[PDB]
Amino acid sequence: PIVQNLQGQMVHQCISPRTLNAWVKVVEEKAFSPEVIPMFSALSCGATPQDLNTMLNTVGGHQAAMQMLKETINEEAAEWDRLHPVHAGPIAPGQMREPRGSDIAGTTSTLQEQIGWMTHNPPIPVGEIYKRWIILGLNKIVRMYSPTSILDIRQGPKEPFRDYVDRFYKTLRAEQASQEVTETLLVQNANPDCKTILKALGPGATLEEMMTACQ
Amino acid sequence: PIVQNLQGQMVHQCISPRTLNAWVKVVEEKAFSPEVIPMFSALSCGATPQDLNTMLNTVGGHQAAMQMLKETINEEAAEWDRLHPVHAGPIAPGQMREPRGSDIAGTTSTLQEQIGWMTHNPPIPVGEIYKRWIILGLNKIVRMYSPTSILDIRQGPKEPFRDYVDRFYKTLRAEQASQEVTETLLVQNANPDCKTILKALGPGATLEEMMTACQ
Amino acid sequence: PIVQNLQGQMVHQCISPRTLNAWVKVVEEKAFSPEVIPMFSALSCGATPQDLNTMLNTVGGHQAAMQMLKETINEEAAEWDRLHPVHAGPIAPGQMREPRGSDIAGTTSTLQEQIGWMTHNPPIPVGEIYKRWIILGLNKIVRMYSPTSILDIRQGPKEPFRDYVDRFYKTLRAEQASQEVTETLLVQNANPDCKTILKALGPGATLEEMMTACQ
Amino acid sequence: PIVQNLQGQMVHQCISPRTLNAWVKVVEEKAFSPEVIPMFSALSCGATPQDLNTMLNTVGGHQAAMQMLKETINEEAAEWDRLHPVHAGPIAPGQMREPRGSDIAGTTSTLQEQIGWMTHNPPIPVGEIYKRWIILGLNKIVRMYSPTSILDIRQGPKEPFRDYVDRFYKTLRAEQASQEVTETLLVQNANPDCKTILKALGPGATLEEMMTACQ
Amino acid sequence: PIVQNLQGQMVHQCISPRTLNAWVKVVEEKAFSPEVIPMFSALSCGATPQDLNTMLNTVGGHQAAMQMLKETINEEAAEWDRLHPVHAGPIAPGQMREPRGSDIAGTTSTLQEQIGWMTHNPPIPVGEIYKRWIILGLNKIVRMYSPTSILDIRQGPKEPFRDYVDRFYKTLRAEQASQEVTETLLVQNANPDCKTILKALGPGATLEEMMTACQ
Amino acid sequence: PIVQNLQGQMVHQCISPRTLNAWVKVVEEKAFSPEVIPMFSALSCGATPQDLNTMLNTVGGHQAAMQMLKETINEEAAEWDRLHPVHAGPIAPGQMREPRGSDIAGTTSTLQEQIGWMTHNPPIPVGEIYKRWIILGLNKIVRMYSPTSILDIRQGPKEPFRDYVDRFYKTLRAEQASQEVTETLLVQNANPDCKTILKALGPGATLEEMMTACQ
């Protein structure tokens, strides 16, 4: 990644085994459960495009997902190139060239060029731009592997209300890949006895009040 | 988080895998037992609002609680906006804008803006302000999931006094979410033989003396 | 905690997950065995009162002990206030105020005030003062939960002398909470055959010589 | 490895136990699965040729592979020598000599000479050059130990489409040692019912659309 | 411990959880096997007397040994006082006082005084002096708990020679607490067939040659 | 070890628990398998003779090997003394003395003297010189405990060729203690069917081609 030293200047630092192992284990344990995405984002703080490819490459399984991610990346890179065409022809000696989609994705750029872009003034944050493309793809994957529709999350006749609400909002989080946009459907899919207590609370009950009322 | 360097200046530093993993495991092992809250506070030392959202987002389960936390956060942010309205209209070029509730909660502010607020002179400590809102919500959650009333903590006929006092004050801590405001109820809920020894100690016995007397 | 930087100046540093986890696990594994106390003291090197409360708060169980510790802390703070009354009335603008017991225990002081006291010249070491109060309380707890009197530590008819001496001095350490003030009682509680060998050594035998003689 | 200090200058640093252990465990757990290669590359960030030999040498098993790697290294070093012959005869006192293949592979050069090359201006990046040779060899090994042809990856009659796509692209990755150059063969090797749905999608369906259509 | 900073000056640093845990686990796993002593010495690199007491205090069991260690420490401190008597009477304002045995053992000195001695010019290395006393005691303990005499280490009729030599020199190391001062007794305690081969080698065979000859 | 600081100067640093534990576990898990040697060399990067003795001393078992290592060390030290005799008589006040074999092995030199030699200009690298002696001894040990001759490594009638080549080169590595100096013996010890395929390849087949041909 790029971090600041005591100069205090922005410099490249090797990705640590600590970070590498964290990401590998998160994927191993959690697959594409939505809470994997914020972990990816935090572990890749300050990442160059090279670092981002490294993390993605250390994933052993899930190659269907990874191919879908590649397809999303290529789509975003094509759109980058539409929005910001780069001038062909030889570039000026010693000068910084403009990055195209493939440079941002780190397929056609060197680490040194990536470093140059990220630390220039003003900087071209190719690491942040590539990370956004990756998260866009990962969100699609989280939504694809979400196994259940919110419409099938209904409270069991013997299920405690809190356990039902946990399933409901966990399902909501995956179906929406942790992006916000509920109250009524939650009451509707409650079991008969809880639904009765809830309807009699009136509209605008907080979740706290609902869980209290059905405890 | 924000830490000081050797300049020695306040600078942003990436959240470490060590911290990320600690928080994830604490929640996994302890749920919303009250001692989870001080762990959250210590692990989030120097946190930006982005860092705080990261930690909250890496929690996989407990989505009922998390939605309750969101509702508490939105309440505190609405109140912030009532107390400190921000001036609409274009802000002055190159100047720091005023944060509203959603900026403090990190929903509508960038990391760079958060950094600017936290390191300004005088600083606007948006990380500390957001952490207070979060702890307020987490305390509500700790109190909700407290499974037992202090009124049902009574010493078993064969239960050692120390084991009874452990249950009593552990229950007290959850019911009050580790916030202070006892002696008499502790004696009242003691078993017959211990209660006898305790009553004969008179008022104002220290807990030490009570546990000694019933050992 | 407070540590020195390369300026090299005394600055506040966040408590590390490494330290937090160490303390939590020590208590989990060892309860209030006496060797827990020196571990507490070493893990809390350079601690502010805030850090000390953090460590104490991350303890999940043992709430009878923790309440006894609170009572000891309040006693020491009352005595601090007797010895060093603070002047009421508004304090001088921009000036350091005097800490009372509750400030030292970190109940009524901010981290910034604690930092100010600890780094002032001359410093008021509120972290060290609070740590002493805590260790005073923890020592009482170690002594309370000591399950056996030294008078009941007697060598088994088939127990090796070394195993008996281990139990004897381990019991002594708890009963005295690792504070020093023996030879004769150790011989007295030895089994018949070992006691015979020991009596014939005469007074002033070193433990080494005693263990050699009964090996 | 070589890293920059606060001068901020390029200096040699000892390889850490953290890195050494990471590499050893990766090989132990994963053999020559393709995701091992990017892990090698990241763990060897900034590596001297000495560091690269160290990592390769700490591998205990897989000695057939290691001998194949040696043969690849010797081939690349022979080619280096063809392209960049070094002048025989005594070199100038105090001056940097030219590296030949065996110096780059660290068989005939000292750590001090390697350091000199890597930090000279302009530098001769012998660590990066040697790493490329090693990855070239490791890629051959990954391809050799790939147990299955893509032609034998066909969807089971009861196999979920996603599970089939995972096997297909994982096989592709090994057979090609994680180097890119598919859609049609993936449809062809699908089972009858999925193939029907897929053919009726028309050409140019994204993988996302295909997996959606066969879910 | 005391380490140098970038000033680069000798400063006090808190003992790390890493070090604390290492020592605790070494004792837990290895007891007073001789290889425990060099581990103690290395883990206590740069230790103040306070740090040394900390490490000794975190040992939970083995209290017979610890009392023997205390007795050895008191003996060395008495001898220090004989060799270097300290002048009674009030010491000069602001000046460094002379350490007596109890100051070196850290029973009657503060951390600040210990720091002063260790960093003075010329320094009085109270940490190194105390460590020597401790190792002297630990060596006595290693020798006491050595369960077997070298005279009872004889090669089994079916025991491989290498396995016999391992037991022989491991026994030697404990009986001598890893202090050097053999060839003949090793041959004498060999089994009949190996002894025959060995006698016919003549005097002055290296161990290598002996183990080769009896393989 | 000796490392450079930010001055940036060569200074002594305590050996870390991380390093100490790594070495101890490597020996525990791997004995004197050849890949242990490069691990020793890397873990002892920058080591003083004191550090080298520390690492060797933390090994609990294998005392036959350790005594053989001592004998090798004494041989190398005797030869050092033959090549570089040191002048007897009192050395000049404040001046650096010449190291003899026992100083390099750290038996008769202090840490301060070792530091002086290693950081002098020009330096006398006593750590590197001692490490070479140790590796020379360890290599002898690896060769001694090699359980099998390359002449007994023959392909099983049902053994896959790759599994045979793994055993062959692993045996070669131990018998030669990871020092290079094969093709023909590998074919000769192949099973009948593989030998046939191999002979018909002609001389000069690469191992890659051989393993391909017998897959």
Ligand SMILES: Cc1[nH]c2ccccc2c1CC(=O)N[C@@H](Cc1ccccc1)C(=O)N(C)c1ccccc1
């Ligand atoms: C955890 C989560 N569960 C969801 C369910 C449906 C849709 C989205 C989600 C999310 C992501 C989610 O909303 N995470 C929160 C952080 C958070 C997590 C947990 C509790 C409180 C705050 C977040 O990133 N931001 C920016 C946020 C902060 C405060 C209020 C609203 C949003």
Ligand SMILES: Cc1[nH]c2ccccc2c1CC(=O)N[C@@H](Cc1ccccc1)C(=O)N(C)c1ccccc1
């Ligand atoms: C641990 C705890 N148990 C409780 C039971 C009921 C109500 C609250 C609690 C708490 C939180 C609790 O009170 N924690 C203590 C720290 C502490 C923890 C454990 C022992 C001693 C001191 C705390 O944060 N402060 C500021 C404090 C310090 C000294 C005296 C009183 C309060």
Ligand SMILES: Cc1[nH]c2ccccc2c1CC(=O)N[C@@H](Cc1ccccc1)C(=O)N(C)c1ccccc1
């Ligand atoms: C370990 C311990 N066991 C005891 C039994 C009864 C009473 C007290 C104790 C103690 C605490 C105990 O005495 N710990 C020792 C350190 C120590 C620990 C173990 C062996 C040697 C030195 C200590 O803190 N100090 C200041 C000390 C140092 C040297 C001599 C005497 C005291």
Ligand SMILES: Cc1[nH]c2ccccc2c1CC(=O)N[C@@H](Cc1ccccc1)C(=O)N(C)c1ccccc1
């Ligand atoms: C993971 C992988 N699976 C493959 C299957 C067949 C052939 C090659 C591969 C690879 C290596 C592979 O292609 N890894 C990717 C990084 C990556 C990994 C996973 C998902 C998305 C991006 C990579 O290194 N680069 C430079 C890249 C980046 C974006 C688009 C295309 C290539």
Ligand SMILES: Cc1[nH]c2ccccc2c1CC(=O)N[C@@H](Cc1ccccc1)C(=O)N(C)c1ccccc1
């Ligand atoms: C390991 C050990 N085994 C022994 C058996 C009997 C007596 C003493 C011992 C020792 C302690 C032991 O001798 N350790 C060695 C270091 C060492 C350890 C292992 C192999 C080679 C060198 C040591 O500390 N020094 C100073 C030393 C160095 C070279 C030659 C002779 C001595």
Ligand SMILES: Cc1[nH]c2ccccc2c1CC(=O)N[C@@H](Cc1ccccc1)C(=O)N(C)c1ccccc1
């Ligand atoms: C791993 C190893 N196996 C052997 C079998 C017989 C004899 C020696 C060995 C060795 C030690 C061995 O040769 N290790 C290699 C490093 C290495 C390890 C593994 C694969 C490729 C390169 C080494 O140290 N050097 C200097 C080297 C580098 C390139 C070519 C030839 C030698």
